[PDB]
Amino acid sequence: MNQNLLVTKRDGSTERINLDKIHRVLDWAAEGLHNVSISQVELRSHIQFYDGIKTSDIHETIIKAAADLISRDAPDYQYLAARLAIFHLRKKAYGQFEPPALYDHVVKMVEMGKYDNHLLEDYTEEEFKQMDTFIDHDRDMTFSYAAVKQLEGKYLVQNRVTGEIYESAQFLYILVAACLFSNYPRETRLQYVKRFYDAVSTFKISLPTPIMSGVRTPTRQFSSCVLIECGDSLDSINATSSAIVKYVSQRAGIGINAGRIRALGSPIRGGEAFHTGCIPFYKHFQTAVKSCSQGGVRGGAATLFYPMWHLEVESLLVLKNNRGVEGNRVRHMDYGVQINKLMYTRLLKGEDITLFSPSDVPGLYDAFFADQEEFERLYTKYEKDDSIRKQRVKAVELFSLMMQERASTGRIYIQNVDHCNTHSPFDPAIAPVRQSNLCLQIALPTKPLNDVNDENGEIALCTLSAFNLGAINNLDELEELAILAVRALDALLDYQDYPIPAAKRGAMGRRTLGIGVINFAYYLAKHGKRYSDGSANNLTHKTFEAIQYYLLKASNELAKEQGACPWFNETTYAKGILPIDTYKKDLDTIANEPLHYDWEALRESIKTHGLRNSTLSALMPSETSSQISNATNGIEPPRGYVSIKASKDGILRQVVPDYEHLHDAYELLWEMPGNDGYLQLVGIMQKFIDQSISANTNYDPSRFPSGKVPMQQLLKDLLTAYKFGVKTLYYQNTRDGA
Amino acid sequence: VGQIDSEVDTDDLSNFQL
Amino acid sequence: YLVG
Numbered sequence: 001m002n003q004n005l006l007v008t009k010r011d012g013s014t015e016r017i018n019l020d021k022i023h024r025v026l027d028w029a030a031e032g033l034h035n036v037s038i039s040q041v042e043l044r045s046h047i048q049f050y051d052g053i054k055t056s057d058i059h060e061t062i063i064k065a066a067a068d069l070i071s072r073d074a075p076d077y078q079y080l081a082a083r084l085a086i087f088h089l090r091k092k093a094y095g096q097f098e099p100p101a102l103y104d105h106v107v108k109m110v111e112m113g114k115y116d117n118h119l120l121e122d123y124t125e126e127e128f129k130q131m132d133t134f135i136d137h138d139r140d141m142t143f144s145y146a147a148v149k150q151l152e153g154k155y156l157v158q159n160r161v162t163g164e165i166y167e168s169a170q171f172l173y174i175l176v177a178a179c180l181f182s183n184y185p186r187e188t189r190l191q192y193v194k195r196f197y198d199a200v201s202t203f204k205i206s207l208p209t210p211i212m213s214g215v216r217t218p219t220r221q222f223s224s225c226v227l228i229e230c231g232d233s234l235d236s237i238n239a240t241s242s243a244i245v246k247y248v249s250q251r252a253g254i255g256i257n258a259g260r261i262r263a264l265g266s267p268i269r270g271g272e273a274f275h276t277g278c279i280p281f282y283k284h285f286q287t288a289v290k291s292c293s294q295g296g297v298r299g300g301a302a303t304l305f306y307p308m309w310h311l312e313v314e315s316l317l318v319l320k321n322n323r324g325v326e327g328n329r330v331r332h333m334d335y336g337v338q339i340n341k342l343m344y345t346r347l348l349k350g351e352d353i354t355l356f357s358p359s360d361v362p363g364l365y366d367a368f369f370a371d372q373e374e375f376e377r378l379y380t381k382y383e384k385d386d387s388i389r390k391q392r393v394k395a396v397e398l399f400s401l402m403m404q405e406r407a408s409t410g411r412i413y414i415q416n417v418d419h420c421n422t423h424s425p426f427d428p429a430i431a432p433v434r435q436s437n438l439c440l441q442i443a444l445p446t447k448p449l450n451d452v453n454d455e456n457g458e459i460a461l462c463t464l465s466a467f468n469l470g471a472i473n474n475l476d477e478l479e480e481l482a483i484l485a486v487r488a489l490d491a492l493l494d495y496q497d498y499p500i501p502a503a504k505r506g507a508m509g510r511r512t513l514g515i516g517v518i519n520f521a522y523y524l525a526k527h528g529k530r531y532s533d534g535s536a537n538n539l540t541h542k543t544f545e546a547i548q549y550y551l552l553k554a555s556n557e558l559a560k561e562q563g564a565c566p567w568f569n570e571t572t573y574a575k576g577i578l579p580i581d582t583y584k585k586d587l588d589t590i591a592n593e594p595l596h597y598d599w600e601a602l603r604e605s606i607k608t609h610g611l612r613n614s615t616l617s618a619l620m621p622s623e624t625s626s627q628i629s630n631a632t633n634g635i636e637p638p639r640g641y642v643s644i645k646a647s648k649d650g651i652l653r654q655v656v657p658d659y660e661h662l663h664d665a666y667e668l669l670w671e672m673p674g675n676d677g678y679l680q681l682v683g684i685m686q687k688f689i690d691q692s693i694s695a696n697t698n699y700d701p702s703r704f705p706s707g708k709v710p711m712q713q714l715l716k717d718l719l720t721a722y723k724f725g726v727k728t729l730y731y732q733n734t735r736d737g738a
Numbered sequence: 739v740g741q742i743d744s745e746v747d748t749d750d751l752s753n754f755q756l
Numbered sequence: 757y758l759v760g
Contacts, residue, residue: 344756350748396746407740564758610758701741708743712750719754734740 008054026062029083033076041065059088064650067145072641075655081145089152093165099137103128105171114157114166116218119175122182127190131178134194135170139201143169144630146654149647151628155212173201175216180488180495196484203629205485206466206518206622210251211492220497225253225437227460231448232260232359234272237281242452243459244288246499254302255437256285257446259338260365263311263357265389278312282319282330289333297332305336305415305435307368308343308398311357311391317402320409334411336436337402340418341372342379344722346395353398354383355391369417370428403714406732413440414729416722423582423725424572425615425690431570436692437462440728441620443691444512449502457502463489463513464620467547470519470631470657475546482550486558489513490612511565514618514691515551518625521632522657525665531637532667532677538593540684548579548688549597551616556605564610571614576607583687584725590680618691630657635685636696637669639738670700670736675717683724692727700736
């Protein structure tokens with residue numbers, strides 16, 4: 001009759017229950033939300049309370065309870081859960097809800113070895129006092145549950161043994177800002193810190209996981225993905241392999257070009273035994289890729305590229321097909337088949353495609369990426385020469401084979417190599433694009449290594465970021481954001497460490513960035529457009545012209561200030577060539593939107609002061625980043641309105657943004673009748689994008705007679721992609737509700 | 739995953755413009 | 757500017 005329920009605290013143990021403290025906290029969290037029942041939450045959680053339960057479990061339970069009510073029809077549960085979680089996480093890090101003063105926090109963290117000591121060297125206590133005035137810890141309340149789960153899961157500084165969380169999102173943002181602009185002149189340094197801080201805490205700019213989890217800590221390893229090109233020599237094979245090992249030990253995604261390795265049967269190049277062909281080496285790269293992963297299979301990913309006409313093409317095309325002899329399969333690596341105009345024309349005219357080992361056709365591989373005229377001339381020339389080892393295949397059989405394997409595994413990608421070079425920032429004769437990265441968005445110059453420390457090699461890197469199309473009000477907010485996006489990334493280039501000499505060379509030489517968007521889908525829904533009808537073509541053209549124009553303007557502004565990238569002379573930009581001058585002509589037939597920007601002024605400003613960065617845009621996919629800002633991923637339409645993630649903490653649900661008002665406005669992935677709509681939008685985006693876009697093809701068997709996708713439809717889509725100048729083609733998804 | 743019908747028509751393709 |  002004093003039947004209490006004793007809560008136990010962090011070794012302060014016993015104490016009576018406080019159901020009113022709890023209600024206040026809930027009540028607080030609910031402030032401003034619609035359709036959430038605090039009683040409902042209390043009911044679900046109080047029933048699992050037991051006599052000596054620790055306070056931490058009360059919080060977990062009330063958090064879970066709130067999160068288990070998230071739904072399409074009560075979407076504010078995400079915020080109620082989020083806020084409870086944020087609250088708990090404050091107490092878990094700081095002992096109170098009120099974050100310590102920035103200076104104090106940073107000092108404490110430097111002594112504990114969690115933050116880089118240079119933070120205190122670079123900024124004065126007065127400077128930290130001021131940054132603290134920029135910080136707004138109430139922005140922690142804008143995250144959705146899924147976001148808090150990601151922050152807590154892989155962004156906030158923590159102890160991964162003990163489980164202790166040491167920081168709050170706002171210190172992350174403020175310090176990422178500080179580190180990235182730490183070398184700025186005292187005159188502008190803190191203005192920049194604040195501007196960026198704002199941008200990233202209000203989700204205008206998104207940043208890669210390695211960056212958000214690390215900049216501010218003592219590491220200097222921030223790579224997401226690297227591109228290595230293998231030469232036809234054991235030395236290069238060795239070096240390529242070494243480089244992969246170093247890079248997967250730092251969690252980097254690998255894009256390997258192994259197209260030049262000579263085919264099986266070719267002559268021994270004085271000691272180098274390539275009698276055995278590519279496969280054996282491919283296997284060797286796969287083991288290198290997986291050298292620092294879990295069983296010898298879990299973690300570590302890579303995509304390997306080779307020309308369609310390589311002599312072992314048919315054996316390469318089925319490397320991930322599970323039904324086959326173990327020695328003739330390299331299953332845990334995706335492939336990128338490289339095609340150009342002539343190959344497709346052979347398909348269209350029902351003619352043959354000649355296979356050839358690169359070793360035997362002098363100048364053919366080079367021409368393949370850099371000059372299509374020349375490629376044609378050497379190709380026909382070598383077809384006729386009977387001295388040259390070769391094989392014929394009917395183009396139809398080859399294309400179907402590749403499309404078949406693309407279809408079943410979903411991981412046989414395409415790269416249109418002519419598009420990559422005729423419509424690129426680089427001069428094909430000096431710095432051609434001959435491969436992509438893991439997720440087929442990056443397109444940059446690479447040179448083969450002769451030894452792991454070869455200083456004349458070149459490895460390209462992923463330097464990324466993104467604009468949230470859902471958090472900007474008008475496209476002119478992109479000028480400010482381009483500034484901050486480009487300036488922070490450019491700083492990062494100098495900040496971080498390079499494991500391999502050839503990777504520093506490419507970064508310092510061309511300072512290449514890949515900035516893209518996220519939240520595209522939601523953006524299209526607020527403007528009442530759709531993917532499949534062609535209704536968003538001019539909007540897309542208006543939006544990607546604004547993204548490209550401002551990125552170039554900010555990079556140009558930056559070159560004026562600090563100088564163009566050392567190798568700016570190898571870009572087409574240097575010769576006064578713009579993305580609007582080399583885009584694929586057929587786009588003119590699917591969008592009339594007129595350029596709204598002074599491209600001619602900028603063309604001259606570029607020719608005269610050059611660019612800080614040789615490439616600025618690239619549209620990547622993005623699950624994590626997107627989730628933190630509650631946004632639809634990169635440019636892809638959502639599968640459905642509520643997406644589900646698994647966890648140790650239960651089921652995490654996240655409702656698409658503003659489902660309340662836009663449910664009928666969204667066009668979910670399987671609602672699109674086919675791919676034409678979307679491929680048109682990717683082509684329009686490709687007009688302005690420096691590198692490439694990770695574009696997917698999607699088929700639903702329900703929509704076809706007998707549930708089988710015709711090879712006709714598959715090829716027609718492939719050609720639709722090539723006709724609107726799509727550079728690459730990534731995943732292919734099959735199914736009708738996920 | 740992907741179940742396809744491998745029948746292809748070159749005549750149909752023929753007329754396409756790259 | 758442009759390097760030199």
